[PDB]
Amino acid sequence: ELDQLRQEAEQLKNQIRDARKACADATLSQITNNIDPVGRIQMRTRRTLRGHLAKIYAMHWGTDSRLLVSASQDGKLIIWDSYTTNKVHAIPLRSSWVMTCAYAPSGNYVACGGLDNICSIYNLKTREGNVRVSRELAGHTGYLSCCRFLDDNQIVTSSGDTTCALWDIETGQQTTTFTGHTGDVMSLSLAPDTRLFVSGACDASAKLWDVREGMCRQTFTGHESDINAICFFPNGNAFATGSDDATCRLFDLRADQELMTYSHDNIICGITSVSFSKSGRLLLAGYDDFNCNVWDALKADRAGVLAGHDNRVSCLGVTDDGMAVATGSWDSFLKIWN
Amino acid sequence: ASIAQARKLVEQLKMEANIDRIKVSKAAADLMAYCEAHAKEDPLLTPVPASENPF
Amino acid sequence: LSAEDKAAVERSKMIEKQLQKDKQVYRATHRLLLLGADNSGKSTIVKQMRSGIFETKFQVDKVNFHMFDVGAQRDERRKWIQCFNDVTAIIFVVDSSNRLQEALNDFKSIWNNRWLRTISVILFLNKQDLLAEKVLAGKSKIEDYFPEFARYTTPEDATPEPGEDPRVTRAKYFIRDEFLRISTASGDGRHYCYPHFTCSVDTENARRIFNDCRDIIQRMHLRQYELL
Amino acid sequence: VQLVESGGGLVQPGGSRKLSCSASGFAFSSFGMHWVRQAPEKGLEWVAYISSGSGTIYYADTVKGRFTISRDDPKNTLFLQMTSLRSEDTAMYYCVRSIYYYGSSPFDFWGQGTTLTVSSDIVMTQATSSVPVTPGESVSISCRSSKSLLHSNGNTYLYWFLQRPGQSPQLLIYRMSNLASGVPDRFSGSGSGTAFTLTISRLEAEDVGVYYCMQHLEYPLTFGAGTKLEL
Amino acid sequence: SISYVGCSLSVLCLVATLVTFAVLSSVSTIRNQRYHIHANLSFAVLVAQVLLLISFRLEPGTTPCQVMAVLLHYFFLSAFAWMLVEGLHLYSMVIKVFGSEDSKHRYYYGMGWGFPLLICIISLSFAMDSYGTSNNCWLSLASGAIWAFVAPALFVIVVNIGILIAVTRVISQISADNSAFKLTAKAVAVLLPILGTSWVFGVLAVNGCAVVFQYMFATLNSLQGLFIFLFHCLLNSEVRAAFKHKTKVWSLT
Ligand SMILES: CCN1CCN(c2ccc(C(=O)OC)cc2NC(=O)COc2ccc(C)cc2C)CC1
């Protein structure tokens, strides 16, 4: 019966809420009310990368923390050498409407996707010397919002058809379709161990998925609007999700609830992209107010402002070694901060 | 019809309701321990000198 | 700088030259968003002047255009329309012949979208001949779906085609007036709506888009000079 | 991905001849191309370099002015025009492709060569001109430099090439520790400024031949004498 | 003394405009061809006005007087050429609006800092005694070779007027699709600085006439630069937006 199923669902949700409140022994602010503040950190624009014709919508660091891929909504995927501002590669794209790009951990492949409902995997290392389409993964009935490489063969893409998908580049077929979100998934962050990944959707909900055994392990609510960005804490037991409600939140997988809420009364814009520092003490969130904000992840105190972008900040990402942050905005500029 | 969707939603909710949950104090302590252990390893909290800074 | 470093800088400079050549084309091409409903006539229009997103490159008067039609998507449009905050115009196609209120609401949240405040809308009222040959018959009454039709007179600034009954002109201009009343309200002058009448078989549609894109660009350039 | 080189033969001294190299299988435009010759029963000598886009053109000090290099990207063919020929210019002229970016593998592919029979610099020293080789054992070829090859970038521009009997040289190691594509994992490279060792573990057949060490820190590119491994 | 006051106001306003452009050059909106011409025109008038203030007090009949006559001629001619380039760019971007985003920096910089130099060199070889001499370094204000500067000038203030009319017509038509006079009146006020249009009430004294040079050309020179500031650095809604963004960036950082 539909009514009894709805009643059972409501009872289960009430039980989940009660269990979550039971574990709320204290707050992260109370536990970390004695640690010294990180201070007023100040990172300046050490390098501005120009050459993108249109608004940059995605950017991903390489494993070596020297190469940087950036996708612009002009049909261009540019791989830069972040140390020397040099452009290592300029890949034309079949579709000029691109919202995501992923750099493989090995550095031999680069992904992109957008309103073409297709994940294009390009082979950087080829005997022919050029970058060519290695694969065109299709099967998503909607725009691809984010993509992340597990390895040289497996990529997981969250697309605006309320689904994520673990693919298989060799066969070009979906290996596991993660369903359960009621709205378009905007971003997904891979756990460092690659066993799990969390994806936030336009339903004010993030969801943890087991990549091997495809299912939603945990669901996290608390946001009042669409989650635009999700990032995984370096430890891998927590993740920060920013929404277009001028709020980021830190959720612990073990506590299964929000730990801290980063927000300010002077902030009315929406978070577009979120990244964590290597230590996890700093949470860098790009907003719609043309500047990013550095938050104390353990105290909910704003620690800095990465002002300098003339348009909305679309993406920001920390290096694997934590050396420098990169920020791509709609002003067609990539800025590196230290 | 929608009965299958309701049953799947109920099954997923039951699966999510049977997870061993730790206290918030333990999670906060573990996050603090991770942040403190990797203190002198983040080139964004302590400004790295230009000798080692590659930008 | 070593030899390989210098050659890498040379590769970067060649990439920059190619990017400049590509910019010479990108800045000279005007992007448009083709929006509408399933029973609107978008497919007929894209078939004229000649899954994912579909790109149609139509050039008239020696200026290239790029019309993008969004397909294989869902009702949640707000999260991909942000990608079109820099296009020249949104060609919004409406079937003038039941679901007219749904299409009128669809015109809102596109006119009133916070990412399209400076985005002009070229409004196409497609398949006007269906309305023409449907309104002579009394089977369907426009006043039945829209009550404020009897208490409405045809505008003085109307240019009916030679051979059009007054009822046809009154109905089509009532639909247009509904759309422009939605458009002008909550309009700060940053973007303008340009209504047109089409029958889905008309070689002039590309010319209308041309003449309207030139007007949009003209007013934006004038605004850059603080002349308007 | 193959480069086939033609336009060579018997030339009277003082003559002029155009050496053509036609490429097929890779992007000619994005690849810089070098001409590197090898005199009979001698080592490897760099002759010329035409960069991607014909921007920087470099010539060896011994062929400067007499030789000119050019490329045709639409025709995918690289030309070496040779004027005022000398008897000290007889060699098998090899054409190599080298692309330059971060993580690139310059000098990755060589061609087949053309016989042209005619009727300061960073000196590379290879002390071992010949080394006995037994299959299954390990060997360590040594190379020395006249100046440190470790730039401020942290890259030690040393290249180890292998030339099998009757075959064109094949890239083995680039930047003094980097295994080229298709090269077995047994090969390795190590060393520091003005000292380099290439170690081959579990030496096998089809591995004998002449090993060459080359510098890429600054033009002109100078190879080594060549260490011969024979069974 | 009125001429000195007005022209000093003009040079101060032009310096403010140039420093504002330099400060806000980081912003993409203030980084197009429009502000290149605005800066070059502001620079040209600046060196065509400071070289006129210290030309008031400079020993007549000397070598400095002659070389400053050449310099003033070149800089004023370059200013008028940049006014013509402003008119051409406005015509391109409001009439036949397509193809306007194409790069044309070479043509603009050959038309200003350019054709003025060629006209000077032909007017320097065919006329040398006219330059300087007299009682002031105004390049034979009486007669002889003043038309070496007036004739090119009257080809920028008879062209930029027509363009103005054309633009006005367009604006009027756009104002028809609605205070129509107010929009047109503001439009003319905006374009008068950049487009040479006020330099026709100064062609009324090029030959032997009354002593009315100081109390007229001073008004023209003051407006050329005060209007440039007040209508292209202040009250521009683009320069103001860029300044607000830069102020926010500096305050946050
Ligand atoms: C190279 C030609 N000379 C340049 C400088 N000259 C001046 C000296 C002192 C004053 C002064 O009293 O105003 C403070 C003014 C000027 N003349 C100008 O500013 C512009 O001239 C013109 C602009 C437009 C037209 C149609 C005609 C003329 C003559 C004399 C000539």
Q: Which chain C positions have a beta carbon within 8 Å of A161's beta carbon? A: 74
Residue E136 marked in a binding site: no
Q: Which residues contact E106 (CB under 8 A, 6 or more apart)?
A: none
End-to-end CA distance of chain C: 52
* Full residue range of the structural domain in which residue B47 is found: 3-55
Using CB atoms within 10 A of its CB, is residue E104 exposed (0-12), middle (13-18) or buried (19+)?
middle
D218 and D111 assigned to the same domain: no
D106 and D133 assigned to the same domain: no
The alpha-carbon gap from C23 to the nearest alpha carbon of chain D, in Å, equals: 20
Residue E5 CA to ligand 1 center (angstroms) comes to 16
D139 and D209 assigned to the same domain: yes
From the CB coordinates, do chains C and B have 3 or more pairs under 8 Å?
no
Q: How far is the CA of C87 from the CAs of C31, C107, E241, in angstroms?
A: 5, 17, 22
Contact A129 D181 (CB under 8 A): no
**Residue E199 Cβ < 6 Å to ligand 1:** yes
Using CB atoms within 10 A of its CB, is residue C36 exposed (0-12), middle (13-18) or buried (19+)?
buried
D75 and D138 assigned to the same domain: no
Measured N-to-C along each axis, helices C205-224 and E63-94 cross at an angle, to the nearest 10 degrees, of: 140
Structural element, H or E, at residue C96: none
Helix and strand element counts for chain E (H, E): 11, 0
The alpha carbon of B12 is separated from its chain's Cα centroid by a whole number of angstroms, namely: 21
Of A81, A89, A99, the CB nearest to C83: A99
* SS3 category, E122: helix
If one residue of E46, E149, E154 were mutated to test the ligand 1 pocket, choosing by the most ligand atoms within 8 A of its CB, it would be: E149
* SS3 category, A12: helix
- Cβ neighbours of C192 (radius 10 Å): 18
**CA distance linking residue A149 with residue C28, whole number of Å:** 36
Determine if the peptide bond prior to E64 is cis (ω within 30°).
Answer: no
Q: Which chain D positions have a beta carbon within 8 Å of C4's beta carbon? A: 100, 104, 106, 155, 157, 216
**CA distance linking residue A334 with residue A81, whole number of Å:** 12
**Residue E80 Cβ < 6 Å to ligand 1:** no
The alpha-carbon gap from A134 to the nearest alpha carbon of chain B, in Å, equals: 33
Residue minimizing CA distance to atom 27 of ligand 1: E203
- Cβ neighbours of E62 (radius 10 Å): 13
Q: DSSP secondary-structure letter at D221?
A: P
Q: Are B38 and A279 in contact (CB under 8 A)?
A: yes
Tokens of E47: 């060196």
State how many domains chain A has: 1
State how many domains chain B has: 1
Nearest chain C alpha carbon to D58: C3
Contact A305 E28 (CB under 8 A): no
**CA distance linking residue D4 with residue D16, whole number of Å:** 21
- Cβ neighbours of E224 (radius 10 Å): 26
Check if C156 contacts D (Cβ < 8 Å): no
Structural element, H or E, at residue E153: helix E147-153
**CA distance linking residue C115 with residue A311, whole number of Å:** 13
Q: Which chain A positions have a beta carbon within 8 Å of D103's beta carbon? A: 67, 88, 107
**Residue E124 Cβ < 6 Å to ligand 1:** no
The type of residue at D178 is N
**CA distance linking residue E163 with residue E90, whole number of Å:** 8
Contact A43 B13 (CB under 8 A): no
Partnered with residue D195 across adjacent β-strands are D192
* Full residue range of the structural domain in which residue A23 is found: 4-337
Q: Which residues contact C107 (CB under 8 A, 6 or more apart)?
A: C92, C94, C121, C123, C179, C182, C183
**CA distance linking residue A11 with residue A5, whole number of Å:** 10
**CA distance linking residue C159 with residue C180, whole number of Å:** 17
Name residue, tokens 């050496």.
D19
Tokens of A88: 């290592």
| CATH code: domain of residue A27 | 2.130.10.10
If one residue of E9, E10, E52, E80 were mutated to test the ligand 1 pocket, choosing by the most ligand atoms within 8 A of its CB, it would be: E52
Residue E19 CA to ligand 1 center (angstroms) comes to 26
Q: Which chain D positions have a beta carbon within 8 Å of C20's beta carbon? A: none
Residue E217 CA to ligand 1 center (angstroms) comes to 7
* SS3 category, A306: strand
The type of residue at E241 is A
Q: How far is the CA of C189 from the CAs of B10, C192, C228, in angstroms?
A: 51, 7, 10
- Cβ neighbours of E135 (radius 10 Å): 9
**CA distance linking residue E6 with residue E49, whole number of Å:** 10
Using CB atoms within 10 A of its CB, is residue D124 exposed (0-12), middle (13-18) or buried (19+)?
buried
Q: Are A305 and A316 in contact (CB under 8 A)?
A: no
C109: left (phi over 0), alpha (psi -120 to 50) or beta: left
* Full residue range of the structural domain in which residue D217 is found: 124-224
Tokens of A318: 């920390």
Using CB atoms within 10 A of its CB, is residue B37 exposed (0-12), middle (13-18) or buried (19+)?
exposed
Q: Are A149 and A155 in contact (CB under 8 A)?
A: yes
**CA distance linking residue D32 with residue D25, whole number of Å:** 15
Tokens of E29: 């909106």
Report the length, in residues, of chain E: 253
Q: What is the CATH number of domain C33-224?
A: 3.40.50.300
Full set of structural domains in chain E with CATH: 2-252 (1.20.1070.10)
**CA distance linking residue C66 with residue C25, whole number of Å:** 12
Q: Shortest CA distance to D67 belongs to which of D42, D96, D44, D89?
A: D89
D146 and D194 assigned to the same domain: yes
| CATH code: domain of residue D207 | 2.60.40.10
Q: Which residues contact E126 (CB under 8 A, 6 or more apart)?
A: none
**CA distance linking residue C47 with residue A64, whole number of Å:** 48
- Cβ neighbours of D65 (radius 10 Å): 8
| CATH code: domain of residue B22 | 4.10.260.10
Name residue, tokens 């946001």.
A223
**Torsion angle of C-alpha atoms D111, D117, D122, D127, degrees rounded to 10:** 90
**CA distance linking residue C191 with residue C185, whole number of Å:** 12
Residues 27-86 of E with CB under 8 A from A: 27-29
Half-sphere exposure of C173 (CA within 13 A, CB side): 17
Q: How far is the CA of A176 from the CAs of A189, A215, C52, C78, E235, in angstroms?
A: 17, 9, 21, 27, 58
Q: Are A292 and A284 in contact (CB under 8 A)?
A: yes
